[PDB]
Amino acid sequence: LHKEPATLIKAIDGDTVKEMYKGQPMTFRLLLVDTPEFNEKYGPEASAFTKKMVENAKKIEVEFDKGQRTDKYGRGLAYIYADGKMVNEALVRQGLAKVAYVYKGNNTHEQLLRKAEAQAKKEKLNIWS
Numbered sequence: 146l147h148k149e150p151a152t153l154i155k156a157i158d159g160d161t162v163k164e165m166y167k168g169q170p171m172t173f174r175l176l177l178v179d180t181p182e183f184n185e186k187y188g189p190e191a192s193a194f195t196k197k198m199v200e201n202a203k204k205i206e207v208e209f210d211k212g213q214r215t216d217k218y219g220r221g222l223a224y225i226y227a228d229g230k231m232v233n234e235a236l237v238r239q240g241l242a243k244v245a246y247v248y249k250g251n252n253t254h255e256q257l258l259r260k261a262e263a264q265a266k267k268e269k270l271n272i273w274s
């Protein structure tokens with residue numbers, strides 16, 4: 146895989162972010178994770194985590210996997226990086242997302258994220274508390 150540029154348009158919630166990619170606005174859904182909805186427990190906190198992460202970053206990047214790049218709702222599916230740090234993984238490491246939606250096409254970083262989840266679980270972090 147490789148990183149490609151994008152600029153933040155707007156944080157949306159824990160695992161969705163509006164970004165400009167190849168000069169077009171689009172909503173990205175983070176691969177391999179599931180944050181709770183804003184209305185659920187840790188939802189506000191997930192949204193807050195992702196927001197600060199992408200808003201503070203001098204450089205946002207987008208990384209498509211090998212399978213499909215758009216989901217059935219037209220959302221981009223990618224690993225998103227903030228100054229080189231992966232938002233998907235960072236959420237999971239903090240117990241603010243579960244590893245989820247692991248489809249055979251698009252799972253390059255599954256084991257990395259599962260390793261993070263294990264550590265979050267060990268620490269009884271947030272969702273795991």
Ligand SMILES: Cc1cn([C@H]2C[C@H](OP(=O)(O)O)[C@@H](COP(=O)(O)O)O2)c(=O)[nH]c1=O
Pocket residue numbers: 174175176177178179216217222246248251
């Ligand atoms: C993360 C991800 C979600 N989706 C779809 C499956 C789920 O469909 P349904 O909406 O029919 O449940 C939905 C989960 O997104 P949210 O967790 O953002 O709701 O998005 C994919 O198709 N591919 C993916 O990689």
Ligand SMILES: [Ca+2]
Pocket residue numbers: 160179180181182
């Ligand atoms: Ca969600």
